[PDB]
Design a protein around this ligand. Structure first.
Ligand SMILES: N=C(N)c1ccc(/C=N/OCC(=O)O)cc1
Ligand SMILES: [Ca+2]
Length: 223
């Protein structure tokens, strides 16, 4: 997260870190057994880490649970990033508390102009590289679909939305991938892609979760 703020320990209790020997993506806990992340975060041997603040220090509230299965969206296209969403099932249910909690799926899509909360342990520099220890957060508005398409001509599908600041300076970044965009208390987006981070006229592009609720519900009902 570039140009954001320190969230505060366990104030984003649905935020997870995906670990394969090292943190590589974020994710969102949607119930005691399932995490929503980006399909471009897929790999084998994922361990899901819940209740994290400092990802490099065991502070006492963590739950580390191995993934038993990963399900990439059947129409995920890794070239265009269309349908950039995947479900990860935990091999055992998380214990839900104040520091580890699920986030609701939306019943309707979010509105242009709505301020959402984007979070992660990704790069904090728009140029250069610096990774934070503690979870970072950013308040950013959903952009109009026409400004989104204008920013990325030929690349924005109905399964994507832009959020952020056209002036630059504030954005999600590498390492935030797969993490939550929460608007009005619902998981509305997943950190997906962008041209660099916090660049002028290049806002963040996010998977439009409201399009996938049926698939999510069907998939979790059968796996
Ligand atoms: N909002 C952005 N500008 C943005 C969003 C997501 C990414 C993700 N890159 O994937 C590689 C990785 O995470 O290691 C980059 C930039
Ligand atoms: Ca920790």
């Amino acid at each position: 997260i570039v140009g954001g703020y320190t969230c505060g320990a366990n104030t984003v209790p649905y935020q997870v870190s995906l670990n394969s020997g090292y943190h590589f993506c974020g994710g969102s806990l949607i119930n005691s057994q399932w995490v929503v992340s980006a399909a471009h975060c897929y790999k084998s041997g994922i361990q899901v880490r819940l209740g994290e603040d400092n990802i490099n220090v065991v502070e006492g509230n963590e739950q580390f649970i191995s993934a038993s299965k990963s399900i990439v969206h059947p129409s995920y296209n890794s070239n265009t990033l269309n349908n950039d969403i995947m479900l990860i099932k935990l091999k055992s249910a998380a214990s839900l508390n104040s520091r580890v909690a699920s986030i609701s799926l939306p019943t309707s899509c979010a509105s242009a102009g709505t301020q959402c909360l984007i979070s992660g342990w990704g790069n904090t520099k728009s140029s250069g590289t610096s990774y934070p220890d503690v979870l970072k957060c950013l308040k950013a508005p959903i952009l109009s679909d026409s400004s989104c398409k204008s920013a990325y001509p030929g690349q924005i599908t109905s399964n994507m939305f832009c959020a952020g600041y056209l002036e630059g300076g504030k954005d999600s970044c590498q390492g935030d991938s797969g993490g939550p965009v929460v608007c009005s208390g619902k998981l509305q987006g997943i950190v997906s892609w962008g041209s660099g981070c916090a660049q002028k006229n290049k806002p963040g592009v996010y998977t439009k979760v409201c399009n996938y609720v049926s698939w999510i519900k069907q998939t979790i009902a059968s796996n």
